[PDB]
Design a protein around this nucleic acid. Structure first.
Ligand SMILES: [Mg+2]
Ligand SMILES: [Mg+2]
Ligand SMILES: [Mg+2]
Ligand SMILES: [Mg+2]
Ligand SMILES: [Mg+2]
Ligand SMILES: [Mg+2]
Ligand SMILES: [Mg+2]
Ligand SMILES: [Mg+2]
Ligand SMILES: [Mg+2]
Ligand SMILES: [Mg+2]
Ligand SMILES: [Mg+2]
Ligand SMILES: [Mg+2]
Ligand SMILES: [Mg+2]
Ligand SMILES: [Mg+2]
Ligand SMILES: [Mg+2]
Ligand SMILES: [Mg+2]
Ligand SMILES: [Mg+2]
Ligand SMILES: [Mg+2]
Ligand SMILES: [Mg+2]
Ligand SMILES: [Mg+2]
Ligand SMILES: [Mg+2]
Ligand SMILES: [Mg+2]
Ligand SMILES: [Mg+2]
Ligand SMILES: [Mg+2]
Ligand SMILES: [Mg+2]
Ligand SMILES: [Mg+2]
Ligand SMILES: [Mg+2]
Ligand SMILES: [Mg+2]
Ligand SMILES: [Mg+2]
Ligand SMILES: [Mg+2]
Ligand SMILES: [Mg+2]
Ligand SMILES: [Mg+2]
Lengths: 177, 206, 343, 328, 132
RNA sequence: AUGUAACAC
RNA sequence: UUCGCCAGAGUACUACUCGCAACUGCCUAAAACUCAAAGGACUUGGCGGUGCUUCACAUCCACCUAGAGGAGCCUGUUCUAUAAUCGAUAAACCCCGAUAGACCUUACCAACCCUUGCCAAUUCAGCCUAUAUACCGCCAUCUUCAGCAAACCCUAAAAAGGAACAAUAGUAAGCACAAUCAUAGCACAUAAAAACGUUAGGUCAAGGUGUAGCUUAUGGGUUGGAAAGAAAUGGGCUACA
């Protein structure tokens, strides 16, 4: 994709090589933002429309205590929230896209819907993805199972560290007075 | 159609059931039949397991009937078979030994052989091509051939008989003429064959 | 003949003929006006033209602790009570024939420039009384269907604005005009812009653009001469809070295209703080009424560059022939210097 | 609407106590069929729709099962699939796929340890097993579904059930298993009746086209049939109708070994002959053994004839034929 | 189209009573009869007089309770006494309810020469079955 | 092959 | 950076000029007069003797049975005809209002009569007078077709459209279909049902009515009469054996 040339280190025999210096520089800020939004008691949604890891995203979110939509995203879900979900619904505060593309190789609907609804996101963008709408993109590989499992493990430990540190500083506030 | 699609036609023949143990596949067929818990229709009022009935006789009597008078059609068939039998007996009594050996007296086989020589082999259909209707010869189904034979018999003996000559003796005379292959229904079948060969060149339109 | 008569609902439904085939497609409104009046309004239930005074319906049960008898008023009291009833009837007629004055926005019959008040509150309990909404275009749009034939769908375009710099526009289409108004009001608060205003009255710099086939050129003005603009632009600038502007529109003067191009041009507006941050230099405003005094309006935060701008003897800028013709005084059109009404 | 449900439960209990009081029965043994006949006595609606009749039942059975509250007071959802739109169905698919993955992992471990201790229990055909209907699965999941989602869930269930089976996974699967009733078209053989030193006489009822026939048959006599006090030959001059009277006896080769007497009413000659034929067929089942009873069934004797004359329609002539339709 | 005793489908806002929400082919299927009397049986006489009495009762109650009458009456005939069952809104005072009850009782008793009962249930508003 | 001449949001 | 063109449409690749081996020719090229449009691209229906698939189950052909159109009679129309009703009058009129006309019905016609003239009252009754192109009430048709539609949301604008199940913007309360119910046991079949709309489809003559017309008459009563077939045609009954 034309927006991945600054994030590409180069091409190795026709294959794109992503600069992991830039990936780490993006990923530190992305993990820090996720940790802070989990610290401030926000709603965090994991989206990955890919049927090779979908159970693993869903179990990852079950162990995180945060929510996941790895199934079909209905059209007016983030946008027309009160008709789909319930009479008074608090919108998600952050979305992680592990895969910004769907099964027919189009950009994901929930990225555009979160841009409409002013919902910040962390997106793993490949060399064919769109990082324009993502406020916190990380240029990386979303196809290889070690990369996907490592991203899930880092988001797991980020969420767990954030919630446990929120609990300890809450206990410190309680013992202050 | 008060019967549902699950209902099937009953099997009436007694010899199909009375000797089952000599073959395997028809056995397996009927334990499938009564182990699928399948619904069977009621037996029709015309068909019966009697050995003195015969199905082409039943169909011919059904085509004999006008309106709803079954007993009148069966009476006409009864006097027709009686007239055929007694005409053949009168022909038997007036002949010599070789002709008595030649002559068949069974009206059932006379009727069957009359329809077997009476049914047409090929038929004609009208097909529209280029704004004109053309007669094209087609192979006919066996039920259609038998039907055309039956309909031609009833049509002739209803139309060109006289008012004084009775219907069963007239149809008996036409049965003997069709048995001896000199009948006007046989001539009509031959005329249909004439038109079929005259339209043989149109057979590629099908 | 008492069994022959019917119920008032059936009588009024047969009388007004609201379900007839004339009003269905649009065949009506040629000679059609039927008014429905509730005949059960001024009934005291026990009132009668003979004037019988009943102890439970008309007058109460007990007087001085005793039981009242069935009585009848005088004939004079009967024309008094009948006069009160009929004077109530022309009082209802006088209230009915009074029509509320419709405030005109741009013209007598059009809906352009008409305000509809504050927009409706949202589902979260948020209430917006500071915004005002105005209609810029009303247009009856027809559609061809298999059954009904012509299908009239009213579409309208509205703008909301609080006067503090926040404004937005939307379209709303429905079968009924009031439904389209409500849909446009509810959809306009979803789409909002913020328009930067230099000293809260005028825009930052001169903006010229071409959106599709509409050419919009807006010019910055000083404090004292206000809003020389097309009427839609005047309404939008009043809802934004812009009090001084010049606007000229060329080509198609389509309302939706003009509004979209205007909002794109005013959202692509570049502020002096952004200019000073992107150039790393001080920007100085030289007022003509203040003389040669160097008013500094913005300062570049961060590192200030010591290298001056390259001074080109002949600058390379795109000039407009209408603007140069206005500057050279060759614009002798009689419509340019016309004195007009208030803003 | 939970407090509404609790209010309905408590006033249903109070009304049950008043109903037991007003009938004068024991309130502890007072049960639901007692409630049904109680309401059917006290408020007797004769209405053709059975659901429009007055009812007072358990409010859980009457009121539809409701969705619970999906979030706390802070707005955070309780369940982690609330933002999919269908939390219960997708949690069910999640649990099924987790069980399938655990089965695959355990079976790979058993293959590595070289042990196959599981058995194929998918075939519950002698029980007559069927899966859930989409309506039943909607009722269980308290949410609307679709046919594609239902087919997806059933094929995932087949994928789980076609693998080696654990006890917990079989207990998970058997929640969604439903049992059919007994499928059988075998008739009930009427026992022979002995009365006043008479041996082996049987009784049969036949009905075909308004004609009702009682047929009582004795196995101890010669071959003759007495219809309505007169001989069968005098009563049925039609040879076809006498063939209808023949047909079961010639089918069972027992033409002369039975003495019959008959009572038929209504209809014409062929309707009476068909009714007598069906009644003899139903009466002969006692004498005749079971495989020949099934042979009778596929001969079509024992099945009643549903062909009944239709009603004349208004604007038509003879219930199919309409009037002469003129094009112009 | 069949148009007898049916309410037309509007935008979805009109309230409807159960009797008005069912088509006439639901009579004795889902909804019942508003009048019960002997004269419509097989070998029984005097149906037309009961019919015209039924009609005059409907118009008299409709005009006697103007606007506060909710819906159609229930007219029961049981051994020459005539029971008139009504749903009336809480509009008029109970003084006026009892005045009209005694008036209607005595007037119809002396007009049809038979004992009459007036049975009322008084409701806050029109009972809504569907739509709304 | 053809079917003219008074439809209104 | 240049060159040639473009000033509403028709008139008009035209009239009159210049030039040309062209003489029914080519190039250049207006005006009088008329109109408020002439135009380019799209959106949705409709339609197609346009193409490709799957079909028709009394429905088109192949094909089954019984009829009509030929005769007599009954009955309803169309035309003439009388002083002598009205409505329907393609499918969706034609033994249709009428499951019903010798007087009554009866609204028609000819003679006569009565004008607070059915009622508790009314400067009031009463009208089968006109408009079904004002209507309600009751229906026909598409139609045993499956769609209609309130309230939201999206489209680099939006005329409008809104689906891909290994799912790419659609949720959708509801009405129809379906399900249920009746033909006294299931099942099938029949009946019943069939939304929103189309035909300004039928009905001011079942009844009420808005509007427009009468009030010694377009109203209210009595008597007597309503013909007929030159002709054509629809549906039936009886036959032609
Ligand atoms: Mg990839
Ligand atoms: Mg004006
Ligand atoms: Mg018939
Ligand atoms: Mg012509
Ligand atoms: Mg010109
Ligand atoms: Mg040319
Ligand atoms: Mg020329
Ligand atoms: Mg010239
Ligand atoms: Mg047909
Ligand atoms: Mg005939
Ligand atoms: Mg004929
Ligand atoms: Mg004829
Ligand atoms: Mg005639
Ligand atoms: Mg006529
Ligand atoms: Mg008229
Ligand atoms: Mg006419
Ligand atoms: Mg028509
Ligand atoms: Mg008279
Ligand atoms: Mg008369
Ligand atoms: Mg008159
Ligand atoms: Mg009409
Ligand atoms: Mg008409
Ligand atoms: Mg549908
Ligand atoms: Mg749409
Ligand atoms: Mg809906
Ligand atoms: Mg039933
Ligand atoms: Mg059915
Ligand atoms: Mg029907
Ligand atoms: Mg149905
Ligand atoms: Mg008309
Ligand atoms: Mg009238
Ligand atoms: Mg007819």
């Amino acid at each position: 994709h034309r927006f991945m040339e600054p994030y590409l280190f180069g091409s190795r025999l026709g294959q794109d090589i992503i600069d992991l210096e830039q990936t780490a520089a993006h990923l530190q800020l992305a993990l820090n933002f996720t940790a802070h939004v989990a610290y401030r008691e926000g709603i965090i949604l994991f989206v990955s429309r890919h049927r090779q890891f979908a159970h693993l995203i869903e179990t990852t979110a079950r162990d995180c205590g945060e929510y996941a939509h790895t199934r079909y995203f209905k059209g007016g879900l983030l946008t027309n929230a009160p008709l789909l979900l319930g009479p008074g619904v608090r919108l998600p505060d952050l979305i992680i896209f592990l895969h910004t593309l769907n099964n027919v190789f189009e950009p994901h609907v929930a990225v555009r819907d979160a841009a409409k609804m002013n919902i910040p996101t962390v997106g793993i963008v490949d060399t064919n993805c769109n990082p324009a709408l993502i406020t916190y993109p990380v240029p990386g590989n979303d196809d290889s199972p070690p990369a996907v499992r490592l991203f899930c493990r880092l988001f797991q430990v980020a969420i767990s560290r954030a919630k446990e540190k929120r609990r300890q500083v809450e206990a410190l506030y309680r013992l202050q007075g | 159609s008060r019967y549902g699609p699950e209902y099937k036609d009953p099997q009436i023949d007694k010899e199909y059931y009375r000797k089952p143990l000599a073959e395997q596949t028809e056995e397996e067929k009927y334990e499938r039949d009564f182990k699928k818990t399948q619904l069977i229709k009621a037996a029709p009022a015309t068909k019966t397991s009697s050995v003195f009935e015969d199905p082409v006789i039943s169909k011919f009597t059904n085509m004999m009937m006008k309106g709803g008078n079954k007993v009148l059609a069966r009476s006409l068939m009864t006097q027709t078979l009686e007239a055929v039998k007694r005409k053949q007996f009168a022909k038997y009594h007036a002949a010599s030994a070789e002709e008595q050996a030649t002559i068949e007296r069974n009206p059932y086989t006379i009727f069957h052989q009359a329809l077997k020589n009476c049914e047409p082999v090929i038929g004609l259909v009208p097909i529209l091509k280029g704004g004109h209707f053309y007669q094209v010869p087609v192979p006919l189904a066996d039920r259609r051939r038998r039907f055309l034979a039956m309909k031609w018999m009833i049509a002739e003996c209803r139309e060109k008989k006289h008012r004084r000559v009775l219907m069963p003796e007239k149809l008996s005379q036409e049965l003997l003429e069709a048995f001896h292959n000199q009948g006007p229904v046989i001539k009509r079948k031959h005329d249909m064959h004439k038109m079929a060969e005259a339209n043989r060149a149109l057979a590629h339109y099908r | 003949s008492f069994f022959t008569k019917l119920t008032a609902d059936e009588l009024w439904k047969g009388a007004l003929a609201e379900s007839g085939a004339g009003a269905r497609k649009g065949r009506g409104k040629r000679t059609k006006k039927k008014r429905r009046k509730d005949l059960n309004r001024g009934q005291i239930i026990g009132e009668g033209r003979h004037g019988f005074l009943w102890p439970g319906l008309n007058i109460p049960l007990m007087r001085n602790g005793a039981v009242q008898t069935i009585a009848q008023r005088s004939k004079e009291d009967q024309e008094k009570v009948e006069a009160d009833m009929v004077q109530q009837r022309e009082e209802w007629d006088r209230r009915r024939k009074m029509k509320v004055k419709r405030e005109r926005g741009w013209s007598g019959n059009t809906w352009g420039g008409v305000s509809l008040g504050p927009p409706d509150p949202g589902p979260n309990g948020e209430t917006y009384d500071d915004f005002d909404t105005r209609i810029l275009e009303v247009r009856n749009v027809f559609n061809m269907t298999a059954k009904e034939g012509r299908k009239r769908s009213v579409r309208v375009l509205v703008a909301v604005g609080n006067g503090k710099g926040a404004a937005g526009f939307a379209i709303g289409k429905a079968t009924e005009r009031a439904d389209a108004f409500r849909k446009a009001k509810n959809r306009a608060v979803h789409y909002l812009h913020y328009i930067e205003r230099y000293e809260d009255h005028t825009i930052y710099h001169d903006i010229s653009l071409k959106f599709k086939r509409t050419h919009i050129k807006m010019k910055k003005q000083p404090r004292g001469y206000g809003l020389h603009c097309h009427r839609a632009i005047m309404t939008i600038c009043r809802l934004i809070g812009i009090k001084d502007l010049y606007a000229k529109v060329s080509g198609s003067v389509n309302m939706l295209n003009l509004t979209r191009g205007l909002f794109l041009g005013l959202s692509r507006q570049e502020t002096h703080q952004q200019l000073a941050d992107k150039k790393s230099l001080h920007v100085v405003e030289f007022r003509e009424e203040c003389g040669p005094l160097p008013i500094v309006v913005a300062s570049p935060q961060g590192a200030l560059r010591k290298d001056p701008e390259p001074e080109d003897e002949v600058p390379d800028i795109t000039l407009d022939w209408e603007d140069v013709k206005a500057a050279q005084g060759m614009k002798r059109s009689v419509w340019s210097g016309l004195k007009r009404a208030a803003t | 609407t939970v407090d509404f449900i609790k209010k309905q439960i408590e006033e249903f209990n109070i009304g049950k106590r008043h109903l037991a009081n007003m009938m004068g029965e024991d309130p502890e043994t007072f049960t639901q069929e007692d409630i049904d006949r109680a309401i059917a006595y006290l408020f007797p609606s004769g209405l053709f729709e059975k659901r429009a009749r007055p009812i007072m039942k358990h409010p859980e059975e009457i009121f539809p099962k409701q969705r619970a509250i999906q979030w706390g007071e802070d707005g955070r959802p309780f369940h982690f699939l609330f933002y999919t739109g269908k939390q219960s169905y997708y949690s069910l698919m999640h649990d099924t796929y987790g069980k399938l993955l655990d089965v695959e992992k355990h079976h790979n471990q058993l293959r590595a340890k070289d042990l196959l201790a599981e058995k194929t229990k998918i075939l519950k055909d002698p029980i007559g097993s069927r899966w859930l209907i989409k309506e039943e699965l909607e009722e269980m999941l308290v949410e609307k579904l679709s046919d594609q989602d239902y087919a997806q869930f059933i094929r995932l269930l087949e994928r789980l059930s076609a693998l080696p089976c654990g006890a917990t996974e079989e207990d998970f699967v058997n929640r969604f298993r439903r049992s059919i009733p007994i499928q059988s078209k075998k008739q009930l053989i009427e026992p022979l009746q002995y009365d006043e030193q008479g041996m082996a006489f049987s009784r049969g009822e036949g009905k075909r086209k308004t004609a009702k026939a009682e047929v009582v048959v004795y196995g101890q006599g010669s071959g003759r049939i007495d219809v309505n006090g007169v001989d069968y030959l005098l009563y049925f001059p039609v040879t076809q109708d006498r063939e209808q009277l023949m047909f079961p006896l010639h089918f069972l080769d027992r033409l002369g070994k039975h003495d019959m007497t008959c009572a038929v009413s209504g209809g014409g000659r062929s309707a009476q002959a068909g009714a007598v034929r069906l009644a003899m067929a139903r009466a002969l089942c006692s004498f005749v053994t079971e495989d020949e009873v099934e042979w009778m069934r596929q001969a079509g004797l024992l099945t009643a004839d549903p062909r009944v004359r239709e009603r004349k329609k208004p604007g038509q002539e003879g219930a199919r034929r309409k009037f002469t339709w003129k094009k112009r | 189209k069949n148009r007898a005793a049916r309410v037309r489908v509007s935008k979805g806002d009109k309230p409807v009573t159960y009797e008005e929400a069912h088509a006439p082919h639901y009579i004795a299927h889902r909804k019942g009869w508003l009048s019960l009397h002997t004269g419509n049986l097989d070998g029984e006489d005097h149906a037309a007089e009961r019919t015209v009495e039924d009609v005059f009762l409907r118009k008299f109650m409709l005009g006697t309770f103007p606007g506060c009458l909710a819906d159609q009456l229930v007219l029961k005939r049981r051994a020459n006494q005539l029971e008139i069952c009504a749903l009336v809104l809480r509009q008029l005072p109970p003084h006026k309810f009892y005045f009209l009850v005694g008036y209607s009782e005595t007037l119809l008793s002396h007009f049809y020469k038979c004992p009459v009962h007036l049975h009322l249930q008084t409701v806050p508003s029109k009972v809504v079955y569907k739509y709304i």
